[PDB]
């Protein structure tokens, strides 16, 4: 029943969102069948007419229960940072619903498989250890596509990714992602995933790719676990002191030995001495290709 009050968001937000503009007429929100859950509200299937007039499956993002202006803003540029994305391995943005009374609606494509922590946790989905290095290739090259465009994405995780109808891959949650300009950073201003954060960001809230490959390494550990929850008797509290003391999470039972080399450097307590995502993409390739082992996907 919201009605939103445009003159106060901030006018280069606004011509951005009118950019990517759907029609209120155009789309059709399957609001009776929730899909997943962002940031900022959940998530449902949608049904969206394109301009040739095809009906095409979409994934639809609302605001849950809408108290201020600064929240539609948070929400709204989770849609707007998406919009130049262009990478078989980061999710496109369809576009931004805007009707005259409700939340707005940012529209993104149905990635048939649906997230990537419960596909790898599904026991007759079995994903085989080479698999399991396919996908961690994957993320790693749209990560090397965002850091390439400047962006941190803070909140990188299995849930945070979704697995398409031919097993690609794609980063596909922004709701706490920031473009870095030129400052090579983003210090929160204005809920963390603690346990997946790196140490220097637990201390001081400055992000940067750096801290973004320290999550990398986290997620590469979730998916060789096949989705376990990372320092399961450590509480969110104690993070920090744990980390600071050395301690790390333990190699998986079926890991390579190097790829868990990989996951090491990527917690390095100096960022500077961490990988660089371009270096992460060609060591998981040679780790990959020399892996003589079953596979059935496309990496
Ligand atoms: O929700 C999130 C993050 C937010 C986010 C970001 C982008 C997307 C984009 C598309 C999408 N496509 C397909 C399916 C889907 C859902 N199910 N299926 C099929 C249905 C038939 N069975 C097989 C799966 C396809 C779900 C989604 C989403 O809910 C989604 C959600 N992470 C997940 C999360 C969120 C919170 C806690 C834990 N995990």
């Given at each position: 029943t919201v009605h939103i009050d445009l003159s106060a968001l901030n006018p280069e937000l606004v011509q951005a969102v009118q950019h990517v503009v759907i029609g209120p007429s155009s789309l059709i929100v399957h609001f009776n069948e929730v899909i997943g859950r962002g940031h900022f509200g959940c998530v449902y299937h949608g049904t969206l007419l394109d301009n040739d007039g095809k009906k095409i499956h979409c994934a639809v993002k609302s605001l849950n229960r809408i108290t201020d202006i600064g929240?539609?803003?948070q929400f709204?540029?989770?849609?707007?940072?998406m919009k130049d994305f262009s990478h078989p391995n980061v999710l496109s943005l369809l576009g931004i619903c805007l009707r005259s009374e409700g939340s707005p609606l940012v529209v993104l494509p149905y990635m048939k498989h649906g997230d990537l922590r419960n596909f790898?946790?599904?026991?007759?989905?079995?994903p085989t250890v080479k698999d399991l290095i396919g996908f961690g290739l994957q993320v790693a090259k749209g990560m090397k596509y965002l850091a390439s465009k400047?962006?941190?994405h803070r909140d990188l995780a299995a849930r945070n990714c979704m697995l398409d109808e031919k097993f690609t891959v794609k980063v596909a949650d922004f709701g706490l992602a920031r473009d870095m300009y030129d400052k090579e950073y983003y210090s929160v201003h204005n809920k963390l995933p603690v346990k997946?954060?790196?140490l220097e960001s637990l201390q001081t809230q400055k992000f940067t790719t750096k801290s973004d490959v320290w999550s990398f390494g986290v997620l590469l550990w979730e998916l060789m676990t096949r989705g376990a929850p990372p320092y399961p008797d450590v509480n969110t509290f104690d993070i920090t002191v744990y980390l600071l003391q050395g301690?790390?999470?333990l190699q998986p039972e079926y890991?390579?030995?190097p790829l868990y080399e990989v996951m090491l450097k990527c917690w390095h307590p100096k960022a500077e001495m961490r990988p660089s995502f371009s270096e992460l993409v060609s060591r998981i390739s040679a780790i990959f290709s020399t892996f003589i082992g079953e596979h059935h996907h496309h990496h």
């Open positions: 929240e539609v803003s709204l540029t989770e849609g707007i940072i790898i946790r599904n026991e007759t989905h079995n400047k962006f941190v997946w954060m790196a301690r790390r999470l890991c390579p030995d």
